[model samples]
Target: MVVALGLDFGTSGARAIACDFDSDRSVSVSVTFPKTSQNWPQVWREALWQLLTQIPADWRSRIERIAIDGTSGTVLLCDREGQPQTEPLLYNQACPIDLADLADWVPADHAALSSTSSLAKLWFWQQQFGALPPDWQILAQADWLSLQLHGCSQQSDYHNALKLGYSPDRERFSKNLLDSELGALLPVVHEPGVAIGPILPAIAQEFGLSPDCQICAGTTDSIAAFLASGAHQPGEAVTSLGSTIVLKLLSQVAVSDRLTGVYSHKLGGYWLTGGASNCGGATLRQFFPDTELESLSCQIDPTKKSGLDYYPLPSRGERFPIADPDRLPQLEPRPENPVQFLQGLLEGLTQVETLGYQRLQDLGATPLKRIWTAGGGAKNAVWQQLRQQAIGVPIAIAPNTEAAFGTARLAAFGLAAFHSAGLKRTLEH
Candidate 1:
């Protein structure tokens, strides 16, 4: 059987999904990376190897294409031979640099203006060492990892390079970077799923993977998650009700707002745009237990307004929908009944969800057509009705929502298996 393999490197772990070319069959394996090591590249390589080996040996030779996805903004400088030339910077590590110096080149609205962006980290490295070494190449987490399999080409996907200030629309890096010395360090950016090359013979021999397996360009982990959700058309959105609320919408126009933490990643001919809010399941869990939440949610009459207008948060500060970094929660005037209080909390969450969509629409995103929900809280029937009532749109759980499955889809795309039965399957399939 021909197969498409997808590998995902997330914040704490790595996962691999192998999807068959027919019968909608697949299998997956996941493992966490060790945090004790200072040499992360080595840890990631080990984790990659472990994930590959964990896939049943019988399935390895059938794999026809492979794709990878990594956390956005995690990047490093590598030598021409794909050796790590500097310490890898993980996502969420703020690279403190002169903002004024960054502003001289990047636009105020560019995603790179943020302190956590890959471009900002590169600037921080530049500050430590005067100029980019001649032999160095900038590679995102996925880009460097893919080179390990393909062994020759150095390439990146537009989604992974977005935070590094590469604009696919303009078909170039920022003009200032293009005019600067570091411009030469940027890797060739491609639309995710474009085939890079066949696996290196040595790599295939060592891993027992097929020598004919093609390595495809990868994407950011979040984008991979979006792809897994069955929302591909304009105005279709994914609301991830995980620890936090992540809003991803497909639109025709690109949108970016540094203040609101809203940005867009290019996907084929369209733009996948959205933002994250520091409120959602975590906030709900803080106030109610699983049994209480389930029972109390059943008590809520989602058709009627709860009359308690509130802003809920897991903790201090909110990033999207409102730009304030120090925004406070406003759950006040507690009702005597726990059911009523739960209703208020759900009401408050719906308001935030409603306001967030409005904020995106106001900023030129395609208006919400329907929402494809995912994550633990998505199963809450009352919350679904509550969200739909406020937003005035249908909401349903996504058929699939795994990043590894999405990367497998990317691999299938690279293999030109668009019309195959297995290629047509969603993550759930």
Candidate 2:
């Protein structure tokens, strides 16, 4: 069967999926990289290169297109020869007070441009290391990888550019809003799913992939999740219950809350607005260790009401649900059973998620009627039942579960957009 490949370059690992377009069937092959503690971009790059070499020759022959999605908002500087100049900066990497004074120098409206941004990161490097040398180009994680496969510099698409403060509504870099320090540094911005080029000969030969296979550049991992949810319309949303809790809503307008990291992405024509929080399974683990957590199944009762209200964020701060990191979790000392505490935490998370939906409703965005649930916590039946009850909404467990599978589907969709073949048959036929 002909296949379209989608690769998700995640924080924990890199995963690739093969999808049969016509039949809507897919399979995943993942490679885990062991250095989560080190926020090294080169580590990711090296691991992905290794994964490409492992693809079987027989599988490569049937693969006609390639699409990639990675951790967006990564900032790295390259030298004249595309060699990284300094350590690759991750999305969460902060500037430690912006010593370059660029942050202070930039206009208030443009303050959304942080050191982690491509432009800001490049500026920080330039201020410290001098000017960018010839043949050098800054790139996001996905763009950098796409460059390796297609042998050229490529810009990030709309979905991935949202965090970098790209104007989703206008479909370009906001000229008036960009500070002088940043305005001149913006790279060429491209739309998601834009077919830029084919596989490079050397890369093709090494991976056993077609040199002519079309390369498509697109989203960060979250947007890939949205595409995977099949919610390209307004009033649709998806919730992820993993180490952290995330809510994604597709709407008609941008949801502006920088502190919350709530942003918007323009898809076919609508906007996808959402936010994330540190309150999730990580918080769940605080009250229960591995031995205790493993036995939680016998303790948690979906029908029982957790008597307390609490909001758990493992870090020093939080954004969505309450928007206040200073607000401490409330747990009364009167009645504290380990199981009840766990139940209460789950209840609190579910309540906060409910509030998140309400916040979107208050903003005139779509009111969520049904939600697609996935991620690490999704496998727990009790968690699923409680979440459904707490959400009071129909939850659809996605058949195509993995985010990389979604990315693969989008890549195939991109190919079928121009070719005679479509994604419906890529897996089955």
Candidate 3:
């Protein structure tokens, strides 16, 4: 009854999922954190404990491996004992605008150049307090939480380290940045899904988890969702239609465009390449009330073209396909009927999605053969059909879009890789 356990720390709360390898069954438990709590670290710790205790007691001891995923840029500085030395910075916390001038070291239009990026946060902290005191270690939320179980403080995965300017291409922290004082705080990055170490004895005993349970490296929440979609082959993509449109394509060759805000995450021997756009469900909400969204969406006729050519954006800006901060939403010639207007918006977004994929391919990624859709917007049948028609690719709902499920798969996969590597080492010996 060996099982892999995956914990995801998202904006809302922490969720734990246990997947039984033999039965192919999984169980999940989640506990929401107190959003207003001033003591974030304590809130996170309590949530983790609650999630673990919520799992049926009998199944706990069978868990053999664990992995975690956290919001991309949420991070904190911690002491040697893994206690928070400073309040955790949530992903959306923007760096001081004054510090934008200091970012000359970062590439223009690079992901790390954003004020909300982990690197920017780190730099902000660095400027406020001249130098980090001895024994202080900076850790992303997943890294800190995983360390609570495994007791390792100096390792992190490339997915979580990306916004901190860790380069998956070189498999190390950026040498250019490392040449500066910031290098001392960077963690040694690992490929996601590699076993970091066995859980700390005290942690295993306290939680009634198996003493043999290993803690594996983890990933960012979005990448974990992509993995959960079961899109592993090169050219397979995941399009998240949340408040904004996010795209990811697994490719044999890595590609990036600084201007387009495009970047790639290393996926073993392949790359998860893509970008995000400002236009998505958020824009739709601006025109239509959420209460009537479903009824209006149902009125859309997928077989008939809407004829309205619109680039529906909630605001004035575009990131992917076209990187113009001044780009405005084009919802002109508004239809008299609400349904028709909604249809136009949906179709326009679908066209944007198509253009996004085309842009990725133009930059040398593999041709998008299929798409796995996730997020709230994926529930619309008319939008799904429109996406299929606009992209000319088979579109399907992700097999499992939950970040917890994806992290559980990562734990299972990591255990298998660990065992195989161990076997190989033994045979070589």
Candidate 4:
């Protein structure tokens, strides 16, 4: 049976998923590697191949389309031959804060103005390693890895290029902001789910994969996770309650509130608009350890409201809805009961989440109609009920939360779109 494969290169590990094109049944495998400052691209390549090797041989051979998602903003410098010229800058690596002055052309709250953005990373690389070869190219993590598979090194997707200041609203790099030096190193951007090319014959043979397998354009891991949630149609939203809280809504119009770290990603005809807050499971951890959280959560009655008000944050600074850098955690008026305190913390987070979506709507985003939950806190049934009450919307758990599964679906979608386009061209001729 024909299947599509999706690979995800996240911060900690790599994961692969093979999904049946017709039935949507899937098999998944994972591989982890040690984090290192040097030879990062090599480690990523090894982890990628290791994950592929873990997939069943029969499924691997039948896979005809593949897409990969990688952590947003991670970038590397490479030569035209797709060889790494320098170690990659991981997504979380800080860019030189002094470089913030160079971004005077960008708005103060623009996402790319920050030290963690790909643009900042590029500037940092230029400052640290000067005088690159004439054929040097800058690529996001997924872009370079896809090059290894399809033998194309000069292409990237909109999602990965967003933080680099590739304006989706304009469908090109910001001409006013990016000078000739920076513009020359940028990749040619493509929409996610478009085919880059078929896998290289040598790569196909090495991995025992079908030569017909096309490597489609990929997206950032967060977008892949939203896609995996099966949240289609405008007004549907996804909330990830992991170490931090993230909210995404499908809308007809795009929204950008850079102060709140809000931005949009184009998904076909619709826009995926959302923001992340500093509060979530991590805040929960700060108050109660995992063991206590699980036990305390069980004791709290989800239907009853916790009278204690809280703004649960582990430390200062807030992003999204409340863009205060000096924002502090509010866990005051401590209740005597441990269970009650946990309940208050959950409720506080719920309030922040509700405000986030409301703020997006205020910026003209579509109203959230339904919410799909993912990430670590998604398993907490008590929190689910609380969220519904707080937001006045029905909530459901995501059918498949892994970004790899979402990317596999994208492979199938890209293949179908490619075939349709080819057929139209043939008919016209």
- Find the candidate with the highest TM-score and give its number: 1
Q: What is the C-alpha RMSD, rounded to one decimal, of candidate 2?
A: 5.4
Name the runs in model 3 displaced over 4 angstroms.
97-110, 289-291, 415-429
Residue-level lDDT of model 3, residues 293-391, one tens digit each, is: 899988889899989999978889888888999998999889899899898899899988999999999999989999989988988888999999888
Q: In candidate 2, which residue ranges exceed 4 Å CA deviation?
A: 23-25, 34-42, 79-81, 97-111, 133-135, 176-185, 289-304, 334-337, 415-429
Instruction: Quantify all predictions' global Cα lDDT against the true fold.
Output: 0.83, 0.69, 0.84, 0.83
Superposed Cα RMSD, model 4? 5.0
- Give the range where candidate 4 is weakest over 10 consecutive residues by summed lDDT: 415-424
- lDDT (10s digit) by residue, model 4, range 270-339: 7889998998899888767787878888898988888989998889999877899998889998989988
Lowest lDDT sum, 10 consecutive residues, model 3, at 415-424
Instruction: Single out the weakest 10-residue window by summed lDDT for candidate 1.
Output: 415-424
Counted clashes in each candidate structure: 0, 13, 0, 0
Residue pairs clashing in model 4 are none
Candidate 3 whole-model C-alpha lDDT, 0 to 1: 0.84
Candidate 3 backbone collisions, by pair: none
lDDT of 4: 0.83
For residues 1-429, could you state the per-residue lDDT of candidate 1 as single tens digits? 458999999999999999996868999999987765679898888888989999998789889999999999899788778788778888989987766777756666788788888888888888787888766888899998898899854589888887787876776687787677677777888878988899999989888988888999999889888878756677889998888888898877888787788887777767788888888878889888888899888888888777787788878898988877788887887889988888888888777788998899999998889999988888998999989988988899998899999898888864233222422246673
